[PDB]
Paper text:
We focused our attention on human [name], an ATP-dependent recombinase crucial for homologous recombination (HR) and for error-free repair of DNA double-strand breaks. Here, we describe the complete process of generating robust, [name]-like surrogate systems from this archeal protein via two distinct approaches: by stepwise mutation of the surface of the [name] to humanise the BRC4 binding area (HumRadA series of mutants) and by generating an archeal/human chimera (ChimRAD51) in which all of the BRC4 binding part of [name] is stabilised by parts of [name].
Residues E219S208 and D220A209 of PfRadA are located between the FxxA and LFDE sites, with the BRC peptide interacting with equivalent HsRAD51 residues. These were mutated to their human equivalents to create [name]. There was a marked decrease in the thermal stability with this mutant, with the midpoint of thermal denaturation being lowered to 85 °C. This is possibly due to the disruption of an ionic interaction between E219208 and R270254, a hypothesis corroborated by the crystallographic analysis of [name].
Residue numbers in the entry: 108 to 285, 307 to 349
Write the structure that this text describes.
């Protein structure tokens, strides 16, 4: 299948991403708390649901939360301000809270069965969010030989993530605070409620930067 692109809500940021975030890839967005990673995840969970003419893929979402940062109220606000039905937007976001790194790995594996069933529907899964990919791995692996073990589990988790994205034509979006993903985006605060995105690593895309805002519509220019 050909690559689908999900608009982030920002024209500037979509331009940097060659149209938007891609299916059949793991897009990693990293930054300090408040850099806009979570607002971008919330905006994408709504945007993917829009028709292609609006920047979406008529798709369903699966969201894995390691730190309880998912906000239904924010999804609802973004949905309403984009002229979508908040109830329908929420019902197309399959949500799961991971309490440890092993639970997190298991949820990715269990998600394959769910995705299979939605493939021939009008709204198949086009987006899988993992916020925030490493929080459990960093807190659990402390002591002698902890670092080498963490790297091994992360690599397998990311391989399980890559497998779903290619096999089912899904865009995998992961967040991180501060490893090989297909696209790395460094996020930081600009001047005001403005953020700056820096494309660090990309195989088909040139390096660069884009500026965006955080509003009642989630993410825009």
């Amino acid at each position: 299948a050909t690559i689908g692109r999900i608009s982030t809500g920002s024209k500037s940021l979509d331009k940097l991403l060659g149209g938007g975030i891609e299916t059949q890839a793991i897009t990693e967005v990293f930054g300090e708390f408040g850099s806009g990673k979570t607002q971008l995840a919330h905006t994408l969970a709504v945007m993917v649901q829009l028709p292609p003419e609006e920047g979406g893929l008529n798709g369903s979402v699966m969201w894995i939360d390691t730190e309880n940062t998912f906000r239904p109220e924010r999804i609802r606000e973004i949905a309403q301000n984009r002229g979508l039905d908040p109830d329908e937007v929420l019902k197309h976001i399959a949500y799961a809270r991971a309490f440890n790194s092993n639970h997190q790995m298991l949820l990715v594996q269990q998600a394959s069965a769910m995705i299979k069933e939605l493939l021939n529907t009008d709204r198949p899964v086009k987006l899988l969010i993992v916020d925030s990919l490493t929080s459990h791995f960093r807190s659990e692996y402390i002591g002698r030989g902890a670092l080498a073990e963490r790297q091994q589990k992360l690599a397998k988790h990311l391989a399980d993530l890559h497998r779903l994205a290619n096999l089912y034509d899904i865009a995998v979006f992961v967040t991180n605070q501060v490893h090989s993903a297909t696209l790395r985006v460094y996020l930081r605060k600009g001047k005001g409620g403005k953020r700056i995105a820096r494309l660090i690593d990309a195989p088909h895309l040139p390096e660069g930067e884009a500026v965006f805002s955080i509003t009642e519509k989630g993410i825009e220019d």
